[PDB]
Amino acid sequence: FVNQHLCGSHLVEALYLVCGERGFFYTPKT
Amino acid sequence: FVNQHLCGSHLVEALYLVCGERGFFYTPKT
Amino acid sequence: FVNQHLCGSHLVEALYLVCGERGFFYTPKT
Amino acid sequence: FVNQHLCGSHLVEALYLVCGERGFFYTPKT
Amino acid sequence: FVNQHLCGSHLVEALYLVCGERGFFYTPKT
Amino acid sequence: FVNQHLCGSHLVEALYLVCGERGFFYTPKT
Amino acid sequence: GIVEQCCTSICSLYQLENYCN
Amino acid sequence: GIVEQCCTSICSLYQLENYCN
Amino acid sequence: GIVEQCCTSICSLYQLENYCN
Amino acid sequence: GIVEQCCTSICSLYQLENYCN
Amino acid sequence: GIVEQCCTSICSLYQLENYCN
Amino acid sequence: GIVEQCCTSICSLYQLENYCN
Ligand SMILES: [Zn+2]
Numbered sequence: 149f150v151n152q153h154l155c156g157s158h159l160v161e162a163l164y165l166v167c168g169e170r171g172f173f174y175t176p177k178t
Numbered sequence: 179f180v181n182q183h184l185c186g187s188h189l190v191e192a193l194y195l196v197c198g199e200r201g202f203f204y205t206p207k208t
Numbered sequence: 209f210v211n212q213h214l215c216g217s218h219l220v221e222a223l224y225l226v227c228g229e230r231g232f233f234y235t236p237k238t
Numbered sequence: 239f240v241n242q243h244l245c246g247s248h249l250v251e252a253l254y255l256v257c258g259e260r261g262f263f264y265t266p267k268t
Numbered sequence: 269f270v271n272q273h274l275c276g277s278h279l280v281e282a283l284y285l286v287c288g289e290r291g292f293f294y295t296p297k298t
Numbered sequence: 299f300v301n302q303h304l305c306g307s308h309l310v311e312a313l314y315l316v317c318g319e320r321g322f323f324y325t326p327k328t
Numbered sequence: 329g330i331v332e333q334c335c336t337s338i339c340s341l342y343q344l345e346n347y348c349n
Numbered sequence: 350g351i352v353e354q355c356c357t358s359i360c361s362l363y364q365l366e367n368y369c370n
Numbered sequence: 371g372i373v374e375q376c377c378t379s380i381c382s383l384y385q386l387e388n389y390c391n
Numbered sequence: 392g393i394v395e396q397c398c399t400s401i402c403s404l405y406q407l408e409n410y411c412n
Numbered sequence: 413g414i415v416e417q418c419c420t421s422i423c424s425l426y427q428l429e430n431y432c433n
Numbered sequence: 434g435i436v437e438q439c440c441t442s443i444c445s446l447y448q449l450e451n452y453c454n
């Protein structure tokens with residue numbers, strides 16, 4: 149029931165999972 | 179969320195992310 | 209000759225590797 | 239560097255490594 | 269342990285886990 | 299414009315990306 | 329089952345959630 | 350940002366969708 | 371548990387097989 | 392585009408770099 | 413070799429161990 | 434070594450090529 153940390157390549161794997169064909173941006177400096 | 183095409187270890191990765199601290203069962207057909 | 213730490217998605221990748229078709233459970237709260 | 243055959247999440251992994259702190263855009267065809 | 273069907277980077281992941289601190293050689297056919 | 303840390307399985311994923319068919323060695327004790 | 333469905337067809341994150349503990 | 354929300358702090362998969370196109 | 375045995379401590383691939391079905 | 396090229400054909404790291412921010 | 417065998421056929425962890433240093 | 438250059442310190446993808454065969 150609480151969330152974990154997602155960092156680096158694990159974070160962009162998660163973005164790919166949730167966004168897929170929609171595409172995404174990974175902009176860590178923002 | 180988008181639908182998924184997941185084989186092999188990629189399905190395991192997805193279960194990990196969906197389930198978080200709940201954990202999960204991985205049960206392939208034999 | 210000594211082992212390393214396996215955490216989070218790396219731990220379930222390892223479970224998938226060693227268990228495969230047998231299936232496994234990942235239950236971090238246990 | 240060598241040329242690459244990258245599908246699915248493996249392309250995301252490669253973008254992460256190439257781009258580093260610059261981040262990147264993942265834009266599949268729809 | 270179970271037998272494995274490993275292509276691409278998944279074979280590298282498996283070698284990493286099997287070998288641990290021993291490290292390994294990755295030597296594809298050319 | 300600066301680099302990040304690559305460790306463990308992420309380091310050998312990076313080696314696979316840059317070396318591919320050339321092969322590589324991962325020898326952490328060296 | 330879910331392992332086979334996700335690979336031969338497609339599956340949703342909501343279907344996957346049924347395999348959480 | 351994404352790193353501060355999800356790596357430094359924690360976020361849900363729903364919040365991750367904020368970064369989809 | 372698995373986390374305590376293998377993440378917090380260290381375990382072998384043989385010990386990981388304890389969590390197979 | 393690049394996503395499709397890298398999967399159906401091959402692509403280089405230099406081509407990928409065009410997708411960095 | 414092992415890279416090709418594991419992908420076109422199957423391979424064991426014991427076969428892989430022969431590639432450790 | 435590789436760990437000291439790239440994990441403990443940082444390295445570029447160009448430096449990683451030092452470990453190719
Ligand atoms: Zn990691």
Ligand SMILES: [Zn+2]
Binds near residue numbers: 248278
């Ligand atoms: Zn794959």
